[PDB]
Amino acid sequence: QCYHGNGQSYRGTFSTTVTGRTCQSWSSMTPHRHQRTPENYPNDGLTMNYCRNPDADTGPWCFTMDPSIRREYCNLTRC
């Protein structure tokens, strides 16, 4: 189970961007501050740092550990 479709149902624990960079916990306003958090979107599996699709993008993504790259997709195939 990679992801399916636009991967809105992705509920896996994969956390790396296509560029090997690492994902930022969704709760955390650091490095990047967002409103796509577990307390705003109670039903979007926004667990820890896992690759999600809270906003109907085209595959799971995540903000970054890289103070410089806010977000990026994730290294997942199209199931």
Side-chain angles (χ1 to χ4, degrees), residues 16-19 51 57-62 71-76:
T16 321
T17 59
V18 266
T19 227
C51 313
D57 193 319
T58 323
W61 38 276
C62 80
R71 21 92 76 230
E72 289 177 75
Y73 286 87
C74 264
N75 223 53
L76 283 182

Side-chain angles (χ1 to χ4, degrees), residues 11-64:
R11 247 100 285 205
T13 57
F14 197 85
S15 32
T16 321
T17 59
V18 266
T19 227
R21 248 177 298 246
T22 285
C23 293
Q24 163 175 357
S25 268
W26 296 100
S27 344
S28 194
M29 292 289 129
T30 8
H32 321 278
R33 33 219 104 37
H34 53 282
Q35 287 301 303
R36 210 103 243 158
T37 60
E39 27 257 301
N40 276 356
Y41 307 81
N43 316 296
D44 294 335
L46 296 194
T47 309
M48 328 213 228
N49 69 163
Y50 302 152
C51 313
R52 253 26 162 197
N53 199 359
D55 48 10
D57 193 319
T58 323
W61 38 276
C62 80
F63 292 98
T64 241

